[PDB]
Design a binder for this molecule. Structure first.
Ligand SMILES: OC[C@H]1O[C@@H](O)[C@H](O)[C@@H](O)[C@@H]1O
Lengths: 99, 99
């Protein structure tokens, strides 16, 4: 798909038998999602930093679908002003900037 | 150009004749740049918001070049962790997300 940038590039993602909305953010290195009960082991992770850090949980090799593209990737789970799909998953789905 | 997202998509812009470094941020609506003495009239603008707003200067129809594309658009000038090219300018160069 080709997504123009007149509007915020919000897409539907499928994460664990659950459909959500997330913004494709090339300004973000990682993918952060509002609390969801992903199964299994996870590692603590600090994100953000300016003014202090926020702790989230790092889930690895998570299966997730982005506009019908099934990918495996690291998902950070915790508080966030919105769901954000970062560069880590955009390379998995082969997403690039073109002009 | 086609820019893959394995690394931060940082690019070179030409503004006020100056050569500068900036990040292509689809997560951002607007373009915000380090202090620069752009000439002529401007408008106060509030940006950010979470925890408070930051006051910047809004300059319209500024000539700017991005990776060899001469374009025209609104540039906000004020403090910022780093220079950011937002969607307003990415539409002007016809930059899209593709996967
Ligand atoms: O973003 C604007 C800022 O640019 C910095 O390079 C300057 O040291 C600071 O004085 C100015 O306010």
């Amino acid at each position: 798909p080709q997504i123009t940038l007149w509007q915020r590039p919000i897409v539907t993602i499928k994460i664990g038998g659950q459909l959500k909305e997330a913004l494709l953010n090339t300004g973000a290195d990682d993918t952060v999602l509002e609390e969801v009960n992903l199964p299994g082991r996870w590692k603590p992770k600090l994100i953000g930093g300016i003014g202090g850090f926020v702790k989230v949980r790092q889930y690895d090799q998570v299966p997730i679908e982005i506009c019908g593209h099934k990918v495996i990737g690291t998902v950070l789970v915790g508080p966030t002003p919105a769901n954000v799909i970062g560069r880590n998953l955009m390379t998995q789905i082969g997403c690039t900037l073109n002009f």
